[PDB]
Design a binder for this molecule. Sequence first.
Ligand SMILES: Nc1ncnc2c1ncn2[C@@H]1O[C@H](COP(=O)(O)OP(=O)(O)OP(=O)(O)O)[C@@H](O)[C@H]1O
Ligand SMILES: [Mg+2]
Ligand SMILES: [Mg+2]
Lengths: 598, 598
Amino acid sequence: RVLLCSAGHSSMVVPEAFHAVPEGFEEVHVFTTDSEKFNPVVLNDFFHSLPNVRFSITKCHGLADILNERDFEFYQEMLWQWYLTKMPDNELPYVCLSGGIKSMSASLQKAATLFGAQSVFHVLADNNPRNIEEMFDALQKGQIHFIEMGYEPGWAALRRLKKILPINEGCSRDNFKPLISKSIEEILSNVKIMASDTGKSNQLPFPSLAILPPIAQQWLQLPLSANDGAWIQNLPKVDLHCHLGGFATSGSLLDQVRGAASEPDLIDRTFSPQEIAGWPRSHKSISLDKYMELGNANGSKLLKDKGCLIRQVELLYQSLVNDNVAYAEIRCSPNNYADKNKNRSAWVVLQDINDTFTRLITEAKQKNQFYCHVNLLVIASRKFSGDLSDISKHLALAITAMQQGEGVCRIVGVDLAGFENKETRASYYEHDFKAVHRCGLAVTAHAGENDDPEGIWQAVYSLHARRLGHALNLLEAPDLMRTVIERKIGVEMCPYANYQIKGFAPMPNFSALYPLKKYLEAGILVSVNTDNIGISGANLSENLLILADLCPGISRMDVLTIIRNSIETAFISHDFRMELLKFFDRKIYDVCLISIKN
Amino acid sequence: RVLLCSAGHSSMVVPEAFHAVPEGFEEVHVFTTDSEKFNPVVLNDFFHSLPNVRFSITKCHGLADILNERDFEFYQEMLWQWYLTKMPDNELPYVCLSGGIKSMSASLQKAATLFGAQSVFHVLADNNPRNIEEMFDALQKGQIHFIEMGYEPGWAALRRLKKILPINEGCSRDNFKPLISKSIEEILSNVKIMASDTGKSNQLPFPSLAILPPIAQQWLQLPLSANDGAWIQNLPKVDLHCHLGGFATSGSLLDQVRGAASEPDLIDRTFSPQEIAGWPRSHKSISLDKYMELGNANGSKLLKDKGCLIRQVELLYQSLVNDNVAYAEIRCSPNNYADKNKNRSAWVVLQDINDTFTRLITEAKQKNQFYCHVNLLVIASRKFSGDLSDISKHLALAITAMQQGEGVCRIVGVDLAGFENKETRASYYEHDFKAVHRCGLAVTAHAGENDDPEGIWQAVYSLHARRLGHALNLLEAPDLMRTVIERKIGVEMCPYANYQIKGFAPMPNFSALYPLKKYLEAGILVSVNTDNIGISGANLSENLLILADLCPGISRMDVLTIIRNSIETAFISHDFRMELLKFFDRKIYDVCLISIKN
Ligand SMILES: Nc1ncnc2c1ncn2[C@@H]1O[C@H](COP(=O)(O)OP(=O)(O)OP(=O)(O)O)[C@@H](O)[C@H]1O
Ligand SMILES: [Mg+2]
Ligand SMILES: [Mg+2]
């Protein structure tokens, strides 16, 4: 534990403060003015007699004493900076103020009641000793009193400034930056709002956003622009549509993933994807057959090798972490990644993926970096070319994948993905799903891509699906939005992928307007995703960035509420959801405040 | 404008403090200990030169100096009490902090931070003035210096703490009661309670709850007690399960209704209740049966006519408004009140109810009062043996009612209540609801009070229900418990009804405990309701009050979360939900900042 104090003429207050806790203090630091009256020799001797306790002195350099308003405000600002930079990262610190004249004592007490303190107290000696040999017996005689006027909690989030303002070392009065002004204006202009409006208080998610100063709060409501990309890079994000096999399809990713293949003889390195003019900003709509022929370079031909798959998983995890993503669900198809000649069953492949992800999560968590949680989603394919029984296999595997349970990464549910050419919607597979919901899994459904808005109703009701894929043409069925919104049914959508494959504004000759803003206005639980991280040629950061051009007039509150919806619609447990929400709220406050100070 | 300060050995601080604002002042008060060093002559002579203002001196009897813990606590108690009784009625005062030694400085700074002050400031003069002429010259020279720490909004609930104890007519050490120290120890006990608590600390209900002072939040963390009735009485609330047919059934509440009978003859006036002793605190648990006979004073027998029904609905709306319920839904079964001979069809009854509700709402809205928006629920009671075809009729009625659309009040869904049994589960009526879901209706299911778990599973998966009634036995089937949590299927539970039916808050010979605390901890979107108002003999406010003795260890923040859940699972459109959220956040912030003083 740590304590803070200020000393003036009374140079022996610090040893009395150290004796406050019978257990014994661990860190002692004192902030004092430039006055020569304070004697560092006695304190240095006392703290060298107890080397086990860390010791550090900071001094208000350039100000011997306070005599005008400027001296007081400079000293108070330096004191607040010192308190901010010297408080413990997690626990609140202890405070003593028995030394110093009324000015510094009051300033540090207001600091304690502003920044929070573990325990604030005073020491008073009846015999007012001067050297150690006197208060030794004074505390032995009991004349020394350790008074406590009460614990002070302080604001729940007002030490977070320790990150937004690079606690700078200090500065001559000419190089003056008023942190005092920032704290005062934030407190005032967020309290000088009364109970009138205060409407945007609830209209915003992440309830700590209200505490954010209005100097940036009104900046949040301004329409989004393509120049704010740096900011959204620092935003913690959530991805729900990221195919595992859709990562290494272009760039040096291909070279690195093929270099990790155990046998380079079988891999056909000659095949290369065809480039599209202006990619990812294509000048025309790209057909779906063109979509997975562009993605035909990746798939299952090269990931059959165990080492190649391991390297792909590690590279995808590294790309996820480097993009400030905090949570992700990865769609995988183990059946495609299995073979019997080398005796690699699909269950073995899924177990290997799970082990790789949990090992990466644990190794990232041990060293306390920013790591992204990953959960898996087994693909129950449309199963082209007959042999329908395969799908049932997948479902069974899914159940037996969930019952393993133990680990940090888990199989949260199944998927219903495939071509819309066969017109098969819900009823063509409904004969099997009377057991997945019984187990306790979750069912998504990529439907409504280019077909009628009818089968989506069966997907919502007959399948009890909790999320929907794409479905950009929901505007033609208001009776469908009624049940979509009323049921709190989430919707996943990937602006880059669907924009490339179908075409939207502002691309000329395409008059269809992108409905994401309309969906948000209607209240649909919308979640922006990446679909195929590699083939689409754009990660989640640019995928969210492009909305400033795809849907003009979109605001930053919209981006934050999409993030909130993506958090809400994830297939996660309750306690994990709250933990994720708390971490996301703290980090979102941090970034949204650091951004405006630049 | 008032000046609040403490003077010890120094008496020259007060003239400078008065001369702080060039505009002058009107009132000055000074507190002091029993120290004989303090001389009052100088201040009296100075203030007599300005008779237009009022001056006073406060002396701490029997305390000359602070030498130990008892002296410190005594001085703190009397200074806090004196500062509280000198509080101006509606305006924050100005505080001076350059008198005495640092102890009173820190104590009164803490007092100013807690109770609030217009502006706290310190004086300082180089010459250290002693008498009148020389300090007047010092003020003329401009050598006087004034430093204002900042305007403190203050915590606005310790104000009419004056109203209970303004002054204990000169309290002595033999009769001193440090009530302010009791409040401080209350907050300290809250701190040592919540210092190792997770879960709840996550996500306040609505935002703008964080802008409250930290003391307010710390108070909010305190577990709720039976003494906090007035706070929730002022608190806006929401009802979702209220029976119209059981509002007035005892006391004088049915007298004015029956009194307003259209045909004052066929109205029986001889029925009596079952002479229940402990109602609504009845320790003896009675199991159904006696309920319907107890409520026979109202219902079908009395609601056949028109005037009585209008009087009953007006009285119910008045009671709803009186309890600060900002939104509620009422269960009703119009086919039970229809009279074919008098041309009063079921549709006629429903139209009359809707029209009177919307007229009352419009009348309340015209006067800019606290109008309670009310929506309707039609009950498809499981009459079973008697002409089950009527069931379909009821559903048809609903589909034909909400279609009319226009009006503030509407029929938003159906209720599947009735004789819950092995047969009467969701397994025979599910053929008919194909229509209901196609018309944007919401379906509840009163089940689980005596039914098996698989019946609840069918209800939540076959009828696509969105809320459940009672359902007190969810802890015995963790699988359906989880499928309730992660599907966001709300649970309506009535505390008083289940208390009088089953056994919790142990009466003699019963040890079963209410699971509401476990329900909330697990993350279910639980919602406290009333079922019936009359027969239960308790409105919503007492229903929430009884929770303190029903589920000990529940905190008021969880009560706010319960309100949020209630306003989350209500069947309403998104925009109306947002507006309702705004109004609720406003009223709750105002309540917790103003009326929480008790
Ligand atoms: N569910 C989570 N998801 C991602 N990261 C988490 C999660 N839980 C904890 N962490 C990590 O715990 C660490 C705690 O950090 P800490 O409280 O010390 O704040 P900080 O060091 O000032 O800034 P930062 O949050 O960036 O580390 C965070 O870095 C965070 O990445
Ligand atoms: Mg996809
Ligand atoms: Mg009922």
